């Protein structure tokens, strides 16, 4: 009899399916078609951060756009100070298996985790003048893939048993638990006023989550293969997902569909991170062929390349003020273009 | 049995369907006019002078 | 004359090897400013500065053959110096190659030396250089005309002068190519042993890898040891000089393919 | 954090004694460290300075050559040894931690202090010397320099001390802006390069004391006359 | 760098970019090993040295002065595609097989297929252990060796069904640069650090030689 159910749930995604079909009247490229297109851009490296001796896994801006953190695989996590290139701090981790890191917005704590199912965070702001653990929020029983800072006291957190979940740090104990994915979530984006987030996982989907409830509003499938990032569009309302088959798109939550296909043919290798610009006309993406292409968000042209790394990129942060690029990778540098 | 898994996914599925849309001419629209009244403070869609870059 | 003959030939092979050793420093060069790894990398470094070593010896010996027996007593002195100081720097740098591969293939753990290629570069620019000091405060060098069997010269050097008894000569080109001729056979000799005998214990009897890269290396390295050896235990005349050119063309193009196909991706 | 320090007494003129500042809770070996003097009834006064790893050290130019300053990390301890003594240097000593990166905050903790008695530069120009006030006003104080302290790269390097009687002189403002960590949001800290300010808006009791400001835009550091408050 | 407080700044960056080059001097003499292998086939009591110290689960055994590290990456349950590169640069990968059980046999046969060519791991060599090889020759007798492998022709004995199981196992390498080293613990009368000394000597031999040309 539970075939009667799954016919409703089919009736369902078709009648979905048929909405979505009705609202897609027109197209983002065949609308833009009319603006002019972005120049060939040509950033080149301001600053080269050196002194990871092993991949590096994660970057994340500061609020103040001068500060970032590095993840390695050696153990470390670095703070740098990105105008000087000094570093700040250099912070060694109970477990060098770290796949995430995110600085806080306020700017005094530091989150961390990998392959230990561990979101451990650090106070950088300490009467002493060492950076303590200041607490290890142990629930998951998967690798965490990403963490991000809502307050000083609650972050969100994504792991590979296909669960999201929201801390109370100063208690340790989950608030909210973000279940529904059918497969290892590996990236999340919180919206410009921090009240929704967007999370995508290897079964090729891309959901809607609402921080105060706990509920999913949206799902989003365009994609064929695994999703290994995910941004926001600046002014919160259409998102941008990356994946392993070489396909970037731009979806809308008001539309609740797909805008446009950021491809190309000579392009087979998997996307590894995404982001925006300041303003929301570039979109720059992270491959496995050791480039980062720059993309025009409205037209579907690539404008540029940002080729300076010897191995895959992993990381990719647009800064905070719009200025600069940040860009890690296997080889062990960070690099600072505009 | 399984009938809870299915019962719940039908009750999310039927949540998430009927939600107000919006046409894709409209928020094309909003798009393209967010990223043209927004390119004075875009310093790498329209680069900086040499002199106020921090990175020079 | 035999002279025409000698000198054309010579200044062959040694510019045709210079071109592919000058060549070779370029692409390193090359690849030291392109890429971020080759900043911390000893063993190119080390086939680089063999190589450029090489290609400074071949400058000298063109310089020598072009003009010897011109000048005063005071110019084949440094002259022949110089010469002697890069050969000796040669064959230091073919020393210090076998110490990297004793480093890498028989003491395989804890290998990092702080100042590595520092300490290196001193031994193998210094101690040629303290031995020419040596040798040259005993006034050994000047004018050194290699005598056919008609009694009559065909070619004329800045080198170790004719003394009627020359143990400066033997003591410090021979004996230092002997000495370190033996020191890199000693080396090979424990490789092929600790290699013949990890494959009698990890249970990979006969069908073992290395057991096949090691005997293709000792195969090389005898080769470039006997022809360095009858290279410098055979007098050079009308004859002999075109195996000369042929062994200094190879000297090169070996060094440069081996360069090349090493570190180009 | 705690601070002591030992090494006081009488001493007789052309003698030698050796202070020791004594530190515990926190991680010393990463702190720059001072040796600040306050004269009987005069206003502070940089004496020496010595790295984190002791690697560069700074002297005052009045006591250069007879003092030399030095740190022992494994023990937390902190040595000034003092040669030839005048009768100048009759004065209370404080220690002073300081760590240096983007964003820190220098001067924050002082020690408690050792009287001893024995038997160009920035001239900052505290120009009043004593302001009688009530609980409840808000009351300014002006600092004034020799030379702009608004360095290139954007930072005015001016520091506001303050101590109650009977005290060590705690930071309240660094780098004329930034509220120091536990101190009220009452104080702030105004001007521009060659012109300062601090103003002390909705007073209260426990604000009765000396405002010294002080540079750190380059050695040796020099102090102010030093602002009374009362009531 | 001009102000004081940035040449102070600058000096705590030095002291920092010490720090971390002498961290990493001091962790490039550890030997990296990744153990693998199916449920239930002593992939934990290898080296009974072990000293272990749910994720990943070091092991900091050392022999000869010389320092190894043991990474057990099952109990993960997750998509190992997706975490795998993190050990893509361990020096070598052990992998445990216990002869005993002829249902595991299929499992692990497929589990090495799936390491062994991998994108990552297409030049890492391999150290397979096959365990309790005794309860194998004392069960052999009673259960053949054609309920698990139904190909088999050979005569039916302890030693001959071992070597066409380790054949077997062996035939799945397709590539060069990679050399499986086998051997077969006991459990009982065997110490087998010595075994993992040697193919590690081996390995890294076979990785410097091919980093000076010969191939
Ligand atoms: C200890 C390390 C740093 C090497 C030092 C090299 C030189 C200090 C010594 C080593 C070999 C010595 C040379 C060996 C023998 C001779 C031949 C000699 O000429 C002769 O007429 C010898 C006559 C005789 O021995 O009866 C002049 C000195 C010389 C070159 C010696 C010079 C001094 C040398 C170069
Ligand atoms: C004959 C003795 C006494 C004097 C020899 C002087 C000349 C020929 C010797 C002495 C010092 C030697 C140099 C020492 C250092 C270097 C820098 C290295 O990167 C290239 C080789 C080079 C450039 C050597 C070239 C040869 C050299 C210049
Ligand atoms: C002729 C007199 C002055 C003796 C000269 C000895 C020279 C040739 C020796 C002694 C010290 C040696 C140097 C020691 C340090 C270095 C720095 C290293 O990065 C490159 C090699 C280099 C540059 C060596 C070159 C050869 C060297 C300069
Ligand atoms: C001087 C030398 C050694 C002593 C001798 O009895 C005769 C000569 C003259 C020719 C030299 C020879 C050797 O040293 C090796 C030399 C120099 C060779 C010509 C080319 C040569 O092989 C090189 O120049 C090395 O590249
Ligand atoms: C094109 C003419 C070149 C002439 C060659 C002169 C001698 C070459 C020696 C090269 C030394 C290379 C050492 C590696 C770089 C380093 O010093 O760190
Ligand atoms: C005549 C042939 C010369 C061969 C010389 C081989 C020995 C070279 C020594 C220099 C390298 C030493 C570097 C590490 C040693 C240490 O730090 O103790
Ligand atoms: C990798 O770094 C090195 C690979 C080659 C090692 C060299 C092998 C020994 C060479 C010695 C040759 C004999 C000495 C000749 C002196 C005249």
Same mark, same amino acid.
Request: proline content about 2%.
């Given at each position: 009899?539970?075939?009667q159910?799954?016919?409703?749930a089919?009736?369902?995604?078709?009648?979905?399916?048929?909405?979505?079909?009705?609202?897609?009247?027109?197209?983002?490229?065949?609308?833009?078609?009319?603006?002019?297109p972005?120049?060939?851009?040509?950033?080149?490296?301001?600053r080269?951060?050196?002194?990871?001796?092993?991949?590096?896994?994660?970057?994340?801006?500061?609020?103040?756009?001068?500060?970032?953190?590095?993840?390695?695989?050696?153990?470390?996590?670095?703070?740098?100070?990105?105008?000087?290139?000094?570093?700040?701090?250099?912070?060694?981790?109970?477990?060098?298996?770290?796949?995430?890191?995110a600085?806080?917005?306020?700017?005094?704590?530091?989150?961390?985790?990998?392959?230990?199912?561990?979101?451990?965070?650090?106070?950088?702001?300490?009467?002493?003048?060492?950076?303590?653990?200041?607490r290890?929020?142990?629930g998951?029983?998967?690798?965490?893939?990403?963490?991000?800072?809502?307050?000083?006291?609650?972050?969100?957190?994504?792991?590979?048993?296909?669960?999201?979940?929201?801390?109370?740090?100063?208690?340790?104990?989950?608030?909210?638990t973000?279940?529904?994915?059918?497969?290892?979530?590996?990236?999340?984006?919180?919206?410009?006023?921090?009240?929704?987030?967007?999370?995508?996982?290897?079964?090729?989907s891309?959901?809607?989550?609402?921080?105060?409830?706990?509920?999913?509003?949206?799902?989003?499938?365009?994609?064929?293969?695994?999703?290994?990032?995910?941004?926001?569009?600046?002014?919160?309302?259409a998102?941008?997902?990356?994946?392993?088959?070489?396909?970037?798109r731009?979806?809308?939550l008001?539309?609740?569909?797909?805008?446009?296909?950021?491809?190309?043919?000579?392009?087979?290798?998997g996307?590894?991170?995404?982001?925006?610009?300041?303003?929301?006309?570039?979109?720059?993406?992270?491959?496995?062929?050791?480039?980062?292409?720059?993309?025009?968000?409205?037209?579907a042209?690539?404008?540029?390349?940002?080729?300076?790394?010897?191995?895959?990129?992993?990381?990719?942060?647009?800064?905070?003020?719009?200025?600069?690029?940040?860009?890690?990778?296997?080889?062990?540098?960070?690099?600072?273009?505009? | 049995?399984?009938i809870?898994?299915?019962?719940?996914?039908?009750?999310?599925?039927?949540?998430?369907?009927?939600?107000?849309?919006?046409?894709?001419?409209?928020?094309?629209?909003?798009?393209?006019?967010?990223?043209?009244?927004?390119?004075?403070?875009?310093?790498?869609?329209?680069?900086?002078?040499?002199?106020?870059?921090?990175?020079? | 004359?035999?002279?025409?003959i000698?000198?054309?030939?010579?200044?062959?092979?040694?510019?045709?090897?210079?071109?592919?050793?000058?060549? =070779?420093?370029?692409?390193?060069?090359?690849?030291?400013?392109?890429? !971020?790894?080759?900043?911390? !990398? &000893?063993?190119?470094?080390?086939?680089?500065?063999?190589?450029?070593?090489?290609?400074?010896?071949?400058?000298?010996?063109?310089?020598?053959?072009?003009?010897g027996?011109?000048?005063? &007593?005071?110019?084949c002195?440094?002259?022949?110096?110089?010469? %002697?100081?890069?050969?000796?720097?040669?064959?230091?740098?073919?020393?210090? !190659?076998?110490f %990297?591969?004793?480093?890498?293939?028989?003491?395989?753990?804890?290998?990092?030396?702080? %100042?590595?290629?520092?300490?290196?570069?001193?031994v193998?620019?210094?101690?040629?250089a303290?031995?020419?000091?040596?040798?040259?405060?005993?006034?050994?060098?000047?004018?050194?005309?290699?005598? &056919?069997? !008609?009694?009559?010269?065909?070619?004329?050097?800045?080198?170790?002068?004719?003394?009627?008894?020359?143990?400066?000569?033997?003591?410090?080109? %021979?004996?230092?190519?002997?000495?370190?001729?033996?020191?890199?056979?000693?080396?090979?000799?424990?490789?092929?042993?600790?290699?013949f005998?990890?494959?009698?214990?990890?249970?990979?009897?006969?069908?073992?890898?290395?057991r096949?890269?090691?005997? =293709?290396?000792?195969?090389?390295?005898?080769?470039?040891?006997?022809?360095?050896?009858?290279?410098?235990?055979?007098?050079?005349?009308?004859?002999?000089?075109?195996?000369?050119?042929?062994?200094?063309?190879?000297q090169?193009?070996?060094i440069?393919?081996?360069? =090349?196909?090493?570190?180009?991706? | 954090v705690?601070?002591?320090?030992?090494?006081?007494?009488?001493?007789?003129?052309?003698?030698?004694?050796?202070?020791?500042?004594?530190?515990?809770?926190?991680?010393?070996?990463?702190?720059?460290?001072?040796?600040?003097?306050?004269?009987?009834?005069?206003?502070?006064?940089?004496?020496?300075?010595?790295?984190?790893?002791?690697?560069?050290?700074?002297?005052?130019?009045?006591?250069?050559?007879?003092?030399?300053?030095?740190?022992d990390?494994?023990?937390?301890?902190?040595?000034?040894?003092?040669?030839?003594?005048?009768?100048?240097?009759?004065?209370?000593?404080?220690?002073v931690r300081?760590?240096?990166?983007?964003?820190?905050?220098?001067?924050?903790?002082?020690?408690?202090?050792?009287?001893?008695?024995?038997?160009?530069?920035?001239?900052?120009?505290?120009?009043?010397?004593?302001?009688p006030?009530?609980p409840?006003?808000?009351?300014?104080?002006?600092?004034?320099?020799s030379?702009?302290?608004?360095?290139?790269?954007?930072?005015?390097?001016?520091y506001?001390?303050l101590?109650?009687?009977?005290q060590?002189?705690?930071?309240?403002?660094?780098?004329?802006?930034?509220?120091?960590?536990?101190?009220?949001?009452?104080?702030?800290g105004?001007?521009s390069?060659?012109?300062?300010?601090?103003?002390?808006?909705?007073?209260?009791?426990?604000?009765?004391?000396?405002?010294?400001?002080?540079?750190?835009?380059?050695y040796?550091?020099?102090?102010?006359?030093?602002?009374?408050?009362?009531? | 760098?001009?102000?004081?407080?940035?040449?102070?700044?600058?000096?705590?960056?030095?002291?920092?970019?010490? $720090?971390?080059?002498?961290?990493?001097?001091?962790?490039?003499k550890?030997?990296?090993?990744l153990?693998?292998?199916?449920? $239930?086939?002593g992939?934990?009591?290898?080296?009974?040295q072990?000293?272990?110290?749910?994720?990943?689960?070091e092991?900091?055994?050392?022999?000869?002065?010389?320092?190894?590290?043991?990474?057990?990456?099952g109990?993960?349950?997750?998509?190992?595609?997706?975490?795998?590169?993190?050990?893509?640069?361990?020096?070598?990968?052990?992998?445990?097989?216990?002869?005993?059980?002829?249902?595991?046999?299929?499992?692990?046969?497929?589990?090495?297929?799936?390491?062994?060519?991998?994108?990552?791991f297409?030049?890492?060599?391999?150290?397979?252990?096959?365990?309790?090889?005794?309860?194998?020759?004392?069960?052999?007798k009673?259960?053949?060796?054609?309920?698990?492998?139904?190909?088999?022709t050979?005569?039916?004995?302890?030693?001959?069904?071992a070597?066409?199981?380790?054949?077997?196992?062996?035939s799945?390498?397709?590539?060069?640069?990679?050399?499986?080293?086998?051997?077969?613990?006991?459990?009982?009368?065997?110490?087998?650090?010595?075994?993992?000394?040697?193919?590690?000597?081996?390995?890294?031999?076979?990785?410097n030689?091919?980093?000076?040309?010969?191939?």
């Amino acid at each position: 009899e539970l075939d009667q159910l799954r016919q409703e749930a089919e009736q369902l995604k078709n009648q979905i399916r048929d909405a979505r079909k009705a609202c897609a009247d027109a197209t983002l490229s065949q609308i833009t078609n009319n603006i002019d297109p972005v120049g060939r851009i040509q950033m080149r490296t301001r600053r080269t951060l050196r002194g990871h001796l092993a991949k590096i896994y994660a970057m994340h801006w500061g609020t103040d756009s001068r500060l970032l953190v590095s993840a390695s695989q050696d153990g470390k996590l670095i703070i740098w100070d990105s105008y000087t290139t000094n570093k700040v701090h250099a912070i060694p981790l109970r477990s060098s298996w770290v796949m995430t890191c995110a600085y806080a917005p306020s700017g005094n704590y530091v989150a961390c985790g990998g392959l230990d199912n561990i979101c451990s965070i650090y106070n950088l702001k300490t009467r002493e003048g060492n950076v303590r653990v200041s607490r290890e929020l142990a629930g998951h029983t998967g690798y965490l893939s990403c963490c991000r800072f809502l307050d000083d006291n609650q972050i969100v957190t994504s792991s590979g048993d296909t669960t999201c979940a929201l801390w109370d740090i100063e208690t340790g104990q989950q608030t909210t638990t973000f279940t529904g994915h059918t497969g290892d979530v590996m990236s999340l984006s919180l919206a410009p006023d921090t009240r929704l987030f967007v999370s995508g996982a290897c079964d090729a989907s891309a959901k809607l989550w609402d921080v105060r409830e706990g509920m999913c509003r949206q799902t989003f499938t365009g994609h064929e293969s695994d999703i290994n990032a995910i941004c926001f569009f600046p002014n919160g309302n259409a998102f941008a997902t990356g994946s392993d088959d070489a396909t970037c798109r731009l979806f809308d939550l008001r539309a609740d569909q797909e805008l446009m296909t950021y491809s190309h043919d000579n392009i087979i290798c998997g996307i590894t991170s995404v982001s925006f610009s300041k303003s929301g006309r570039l979109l720059l993406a992270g491959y496995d062929d050791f480039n980062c292409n720059v993309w025009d968000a409205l037209k579907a042209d690539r404008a540029g390349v940002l080729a300076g790394h010897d191995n895959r990129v992993s990381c990719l942060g647009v800064t905070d003020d719009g200025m600069a690029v940040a860009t890690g990778s296997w080889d062990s540098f960070l690099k600072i273009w505009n | 049995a399984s009938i809870a898994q299915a019962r719940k996914l039908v009750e999310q599925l039927k949540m998430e369907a009927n939600i107000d849309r919006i046409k894709v001419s409209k928020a094309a629209a909003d798009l393209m006019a967010y990223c043209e009244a927004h390119a004075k403070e875009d310093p790498l869609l329209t680069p900086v002078p040499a002199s106020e870059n921090p990175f020079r | 004359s035999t002279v025409h003959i000698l000198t054309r030939i010579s200044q062959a092979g040694c510019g045709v090897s210079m071109i592919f050793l000058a060549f =070779t420093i370029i692409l390193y060069a090359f690849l030291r400013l392109s890429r !971020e790894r080759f900043k911390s !990398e &000893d063993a190119p470094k080390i086939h680089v500065a063999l190589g450029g070593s090489l290609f400074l010896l071949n400058l000298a010996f063109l310089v020598n053959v072009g003009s010897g027996s011109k000048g005063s &007593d005071a110019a084949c002195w440094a002259r022949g110096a110089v010469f %002697h100081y890069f050969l000796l720097c040669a064959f230091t740098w073919m020393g210090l !190659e076998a110490f %990297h591969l004793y480093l890498l293939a028989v003491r395989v753990f804890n290998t990092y030396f702080g %100042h590595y290629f520092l300490k290196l570069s001193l031994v193998g620019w210094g101690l040629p250089a303290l031995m020419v000091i040596g040798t040259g405060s005993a006034n050994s060098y000047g004018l050194y005309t290699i005598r &056919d069997r !008609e009694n009559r010269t065909s070619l004329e050097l800045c080198w170790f002068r004719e003394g009627t008894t020359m143990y400066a000569l033997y003591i410090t080109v %021979h004996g230092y190519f002997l000495i370190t001729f033996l020191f890199g056979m000693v080396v090979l000799a424990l490789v092929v042993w600790k290699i013949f005998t990890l494959s009698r214990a990890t249970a990979v009897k006969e069908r073992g890898k290395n057991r096949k890269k090691v005997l =293709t290396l000792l195969g090389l390295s005898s080769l470039v040891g006997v022809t360095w050896g009858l290279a410098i235990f055979t007098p050079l005349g009308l004859s002999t000089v075109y195996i000369f050119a042929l062994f200094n063309s190879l000297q090169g193009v070996f060094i440069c393919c081996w360069f =090349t196909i090493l570190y180009l991706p | 954090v705690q601070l002591v320090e030992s090494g006081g007494g009488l001493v007789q003129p052309g003698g030698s004694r050796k202070l020791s500042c004594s530190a515990s809770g926190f991680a010393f070996s990463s702190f720059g460290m001072h040796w600040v003097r306050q004269a009987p009834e005069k206003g502070l006064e940089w004496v020496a300075y010595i790295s984190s790893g002791s690697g560069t050290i700074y002297y005052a130019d009045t006591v250069k050559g007879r003092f030399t300053i030095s740190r022992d990390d494994p023990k937390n301890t902190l040595f000034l040894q003092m040669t030839s003594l005048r009768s100048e240097d009759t004065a209370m000593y404080y220690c002073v931690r300081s760590i240096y990166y983007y964003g820190s905050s220098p001067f924050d903790f002082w020690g408690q202090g050792t009287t001893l008695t024995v038997s160009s530069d920035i001239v900052m120009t505290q120009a009043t010397s004593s302001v009688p006030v009530t609980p409840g006003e808000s009351v300014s104080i002006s600092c004034r320099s020799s030379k702009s302290l608004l360095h290139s790269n954007g930072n005015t390097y001016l520091y506001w001390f303050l101590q109650r009687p009977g005290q060590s002189p705690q930071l309240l403002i660094y780098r004329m802006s930034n509220l120091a960590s536990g101190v009220p949001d009452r104080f702030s800290g105004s001007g521009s390069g060659t012109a300062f300010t601090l103003t002390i808006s909705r007073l209260e009791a426990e604000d009765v004391g000396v405002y010294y400001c002080m540079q750190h835009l380059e050695y040796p550091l020099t102090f102010g006359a030093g602002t009374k408050l009362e009531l | 760098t001009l102000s004081a407080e940035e040449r102070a700044a600058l000096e705590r960056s030095k002291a920092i970019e010490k $720090n971390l080059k002498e961290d990493g001097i001091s962790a490039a003499k550890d030997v990296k090993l990744l153990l693998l292998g199916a449920d $239930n086939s002593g992939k934990s009591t290898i080296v009974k040295q072990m000293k272990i110290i749910t994720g990943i689960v070091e092991t900091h055994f050392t022999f000869k002065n010389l320092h190894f590290r043991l990474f057990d990456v099952g109990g993960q349950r997750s998509e190992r595609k997706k975490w795998i590169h993190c050990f893509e640069d361990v020096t070598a990968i052990i992998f445990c097989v216990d002869l005993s059980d002829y249902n595991r046999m299929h499992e692990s046969l497929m589990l090495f297929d799936s390491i062994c060519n991998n994108k990552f791991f297409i030049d890492t060599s391999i150290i397979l252990f096959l365990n309790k090889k005794d309860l194998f020759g004392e069960k052999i007798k009673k259960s053949p060796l054609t309920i698990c492998f139904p190909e088999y022709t050979g005569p039916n004995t302890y030693e001959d069904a071992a070597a066409y199981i380790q054949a077997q196992f062996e035939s799945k390498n397709r590539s060069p640069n990679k050399e499986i080293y086998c051997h077969m613990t006991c459990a009982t009368d065997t110490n087998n650090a010595q075994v993992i000394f040697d193919a590690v000597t081996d390995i890294i031999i076979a990785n410097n030689l091919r980093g000076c040309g010969l191939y």
